[PDB]
Design an enzyme around this catalytic site. Structure first.
Site, mmCIF file in Angstrom:
data_model
loop_
_atom_site.group_PDB
_atom_site.id
_atom_site.type_symbol
_atom_site.label_atom_id
_atom_site.label_comp_id
_atom_site.label_asym_id
_atom_site.label_seq_id
_atom_site.Cartn_x
_atom_site.Cartn_y
_atom_site.Cartn_z
ATOM 1 N N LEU A 1 -9.228 -54.633 -37.448
ATOM 2 C CA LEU A 1 -9.379 -55.431 -36.086
ATOM 3 C C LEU A 1 -10.673 -54.135 -35.054
ATOM 4 O O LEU A 1 -10.720 -52.982 -35.405
ATOM 5 C CB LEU A 1 -8.022 -55.363 -35.035
ATOM 6 N N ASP A 2 -11.494 -55.178 -34.720
ATOM 7 C CA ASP A 2 -12.697 -54.631 -33.842
ATOM 8 C C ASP A 2 -12.424 -54.145 -32.818
ATOM 9 O O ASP A 2 -10.869 -54.267 -31.727
ATOM 10 C CB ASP A 2 -13.521 -55.168 -33.465
ATOM 11 N N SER A 3 -12.666 -52.848 -32.094
ATOM 12 C CA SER A 3 -12.324 -52.156 -31.185
ATOM 13 C C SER A 3 -12.241 -53.096 -29.824
ATOM 14 O O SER A 3 -11.807 -53.614 -28.436
ATOM 15 C CB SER A 3 -13.252 -50.942 -30.878
#
Ligand code: SF4
Ligand code: SF4
Lengths: 232, 116, 119, 77, 78, 60, 180
Positions: free
Chosen positions: D36-38
């Site tokens: 998951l992206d930040s």
């Protein structure tokens, strides 16, 4: 008194009202009122130079006014002074704004005109700021700033620092770009509005004018070479 | 001597701190999306708002200089400031949303042959 | 400890009330100003030799004269309440001027590109 | 606590980009386990707080990295 | 704690000779916070006279402050 | 209440006669008991401007 | 250090007592200062009005007032405009668009002559610079078209407008040309 205007007492005058002669407007002097004041003001600039030599750059005097060049990282200690000194009791600011000259690597000089009250004397104070790097505001010293620096930010994108409510005033609320940069021209990028099909959504387009601003690209030989004058 | 939704202007130094600050900005800018759809009465859904906000921040994922990212942060937080209340109007607000296709008719299929 | 910087709700001329004891408060402010600036930054600097000398000049004219009106016509400023208001902030100005030490060399040289307009 | 994370593993499953719900162990990471992206991390955090109708402070959004932390903050009401 | 609401003061005709869009917030019909909002009329003269000559500049220039016209002419001319 | 004391006063001012020398006394007592309520309410009812400060400024 | 700025003289102005002796309570109590203003507006009520029945009457029209751009010609006029382009280069909204050509008989004339009456500020610089005094601000306010297409004045409209009146323009110039 009486006998002024209508419901008339039958008394008036439009006669014998003259002073007939040939003119004698004996003058030649362009700017000689200022020279004693310029000679005073050189010495005043030399005082400001010797008093705060770290934070100031070279003064520049011209025709009864004064402009102090200031390194941009340090303006707040300069303007704690020079607003608020005893000998410099200015306390009244009249303009902060910006000027681009996109010649040099730093791009936007930022110009302040201040006004004295005790002394009836203006002054100018300049920094230089880039679109990249900010320079701090002067709203910490007084409250007349926080409107003007919004105006400076909106017209230029000269970004500021240490400041509350850096909004837009002077443009549309969805409008990016910065107008008084000499990048984008008079027409603007998106400036149209129409509302027919997608109803009432007055949405822009590519601004295609109806006749373009046919410019002025004429220039003569050379304006003048200045007859300099300094006190020293 | 006032604010409207606490717009602050103070750019930090370190890129990690600017990362965290843009992250919290993204959270508020994402949380205000049902408030946006309430406020402006758009046709599209709240997930359309969310995917376009994500699109707008992915437009500047790979920008290097923190001293560019500062004024990008100011633009982001400032347009959040002008969206969180009713300064912007819906005609001003649809300038982010190329929503419909049927306005254009048949158009360029990005071929050279149909430039002519 | 001079709380007579500016008074409250009395009617002097321009929206700033009349201080009760302007001479002792003012001479205490001059004493504190001379105590702060003289013992912080060197006598080499022109700034100290300007603020200090003007401070001693004002101190002389205050300590000499008696009424709150002849001191106006010699002091060269406006009202004596406003003289006290003016005389407040250079104490805090020199007190700030302890920090951001201005008598040093000029910290930055601009490229001289920045200060070129025309010709 | 019980079946709060049922709702959370319903919302995150309803969220896209996670093609394997079998890869969603409940007590597991966000960006290590699922990539998951930040940005997308706090995106699904705001999705979680919007599902339960609850509002979180900033540091509570800062500390969330796994959903056991999330359930542990869900436990605060 | 304070829970204050807001109004928009003038779209068109609140104060005459002014498009006075004033976003004004009240608690007890007290103006605890005031946020003037002007700039609806940013006609952009400040840009436009960068491409006009000086003789051309003046009929831009009293369009600013349209109740004191030739005084504004005079300050530009000075 | 200041309406329906006028509703109280209205029958008295209808038949001011048939009560002479005595209805005057009773209604004077009534108006005394009401006017002291007025002198209660004169002391307080006004709005208050919340933000206007003036205290003198001190230095160290 | 003289530094002559001083002397506001700060009037202390206690003004506690002796404004009035119960006359104050009279002027406050009944509205004498305000009844005075009512008597003033009643005395103003009797005097003259100032309306000008505009279809039938007209306000003062100075000779230097500006109008609708009628092109003059000479006595036995050969279309006095020479397309000299001076009236182009100062129209501050660029509402002038000219094109010119050597006409058949040798001289130069206007091929087309274009005034954006959408964007004519009426600065009169056109009149202040056309050296043969051929474009002239009229005094006539004869307007109010329903389309923009009825505003964009070509050459024929302006020559027609000058042909409609030069009488008024001759009155105007013969009171103004020794001042222009
Ligand atoms: S009157 Fe003024 S705006 Fe009109 S065409 Fe002449 S110069 Fe231009
Ligand atoms: S100024 Fe005269 S010559 Fe020039 S275009 Fe106008 S009418 Fe023709």
């Amino acid at each position: 008194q009486a006998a002024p205007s209508w419901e008339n007492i039958k008394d008036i005058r439009l006669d014998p009202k003259v002073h007939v002669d040939e003119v004698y407007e004996p003058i030649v002097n362009p700017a000689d009122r200022y020279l004693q004041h310029v000679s005073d003001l050189h010495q005043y600039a030399k005082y400001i130079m010797a008093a705060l030599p770290k934070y100031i750059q070279g003064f520049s005097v011209w025709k009864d006014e004064l402009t102090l060049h200031v390194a941009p990282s340090a303006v707040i200690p300069v303007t704690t002074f020079l607003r608020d000194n005893t000998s410099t009791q200015y306390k009244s600011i009249i303009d902060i704004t910006a000027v681009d000259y996109p010649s040099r690597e730093n791009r936007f000089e930022v110009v302040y005109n201040f006004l004295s009250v005790r002394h009836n004397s203006r002054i100018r104070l300049k920094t230089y700021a880039t679109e990249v790097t900010p320079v701090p505001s002067i709203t910490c010293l007084y409250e007349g700033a926080n409107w003007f620096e919004r105006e400076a930010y909106d017209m230029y994108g000269v970004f500021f620092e240490g400041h509350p409510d850096l909004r837009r005033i002077m443009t549309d609320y969805g409008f990016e770009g910065h107008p008084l940069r000499k990048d984008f021209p008079l027409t603007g990028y998106t400036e149209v509005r129409w509302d027919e099909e997608k109803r009432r959504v007055v949405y822009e387009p590519l601004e295609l004018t109806q006749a373009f601003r046919n410019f002025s690209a004429g220039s003569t030989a050379w304006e003048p070479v200045g007859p300099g004058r300094d006190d020293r | 001597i006032a604010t409207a939704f606490a717009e602050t202007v103070k750019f930090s130094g370190s890129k990690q701190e600017l990362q965290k600050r843009t992250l919290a900005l993204y959270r508020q800018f994402l949380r205000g999306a049902p408030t946006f759809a309430d406020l402006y009465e758009v046709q599209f859904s709240i997930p359309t708002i969310r995917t376009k906000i994500r699109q707008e921040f992915e437009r500047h994922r790979f920008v290097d200089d923190l001293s560019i990212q500062n004024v990008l942060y100011a633009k982001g937080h400032m347009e959040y400031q002008e969206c969180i209340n009713f300064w912007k109007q819906q005609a001003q607000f649809l300038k982010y949303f190329p929503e419909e296709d049927d306005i254009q008719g048949r158009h360029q299929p990005s071929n050279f042959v149909d430039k002519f | 400890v001079l709380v007579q910087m500016r008074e409250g709700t009395p009617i002097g001329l321009t929206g700033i009330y009349q201080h009760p004891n302007p001479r002792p408060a003012l001479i205490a402010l001059y004493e504190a100003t001379l105590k702060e600036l003289q013992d912080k930054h060197p006598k080499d600097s022109v700034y100290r030799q300007s603020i200090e000398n003007l401070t001693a000049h004002r101190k002389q004219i205050v300590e000499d004269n008696e009424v709150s009106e002849v001191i106006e016509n010699k002091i060269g400023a406006g009202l004596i309440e406003e003289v006290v208001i003016q005389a407040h902030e250079e104490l805090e100005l020199a007190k700030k001027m302890s920090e951001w030490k201005p008598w040093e060399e000029l910290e930055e040289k601009p490229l001289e590109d920045q200060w070129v307009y025309f010709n | 606590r019980p079946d709060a994370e049922k709702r959370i593993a319903a919302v995150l499953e309803s969220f896209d980009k996670i093609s394997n719900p079998a890869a969603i162990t409940p007590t597991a990471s966000f960006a290590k386990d699922l990539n998951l992206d930040s940005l997308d991390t706090v995106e699904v955090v705001v999705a979680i707080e919007e599902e339960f109708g609850i509002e979180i402070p900033d540091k509570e959004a800062d500390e969330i990295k796994s959903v056991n932390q999330a359930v542990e903050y869900i436990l605060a009401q | 704690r304070i829970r204050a609401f807001t109004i928009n003061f003038g779209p068109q005709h609140p104060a005459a000779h002014g498009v006075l869009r004033l976003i004004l917030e009240l608690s007890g019909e007290e103006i605890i916070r005031s946020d003037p909002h002007v700039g609806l009329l940013h006609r952009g003269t400040e840009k436009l006279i960068e491409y006009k000559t000086y003789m051309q500049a003046l009929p831009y220039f009293d369009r600013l402050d349209y109740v004191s016209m030739m005084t504004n002419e005079q300050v530009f001319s000075l | 209440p200041f309406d329906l004391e006028i509703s109280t006063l209205l029958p008295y001012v209808m038949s001011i006669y048939l009560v002479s020398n005595y209805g005057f006394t009773i209604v004077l007592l009534f108006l005394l008991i009401l006017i002291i309520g007025f002198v209660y309410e004169i002391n307080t009812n006004a709005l208050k401007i919340n933000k206007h400060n003036k205290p003198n400024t001190d230095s160290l | 250090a003289p530094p002559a700025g001083f002397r506001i003289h700060r009037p202390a102005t206690w003004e506690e007592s002796e404004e009035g002796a119960l006359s104050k309570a009279t002027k406050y109590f009944l509205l004498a200062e305000m009844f005075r203003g009512l008597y003033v507006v009643l005395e103003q009520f009797f005097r003259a009005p100032y309306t000008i029945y505009y279809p039938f009457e007209k306000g003062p029209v100075s000779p230097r007032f500006r109008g609708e751009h009628a092109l003059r010609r000479y006595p036995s006029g050969e279309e006095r405009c020479i397309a000299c382009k001076l009236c182009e280069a100062i129209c501050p909204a660029l509402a002038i668009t000219i094109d010119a050509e050597e006409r058949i008989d040798g001289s130069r004339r206007t091929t087309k002559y274009d005034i954006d009456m959408t964007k004519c500020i009426y600065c009169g610089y056109c009149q202040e610079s056309c050296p043969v005094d051929a474009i002239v601000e009229t005094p006539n306010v004869e307007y109010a078209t329903e389309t923009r297409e009825e505003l964009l004045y070509n050459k024929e409209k302006l020559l027609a407008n000058g042909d409609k009146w030069e009488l008024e323009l001759q009155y105007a110039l013969d009171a103004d040309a020794p001042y222009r």
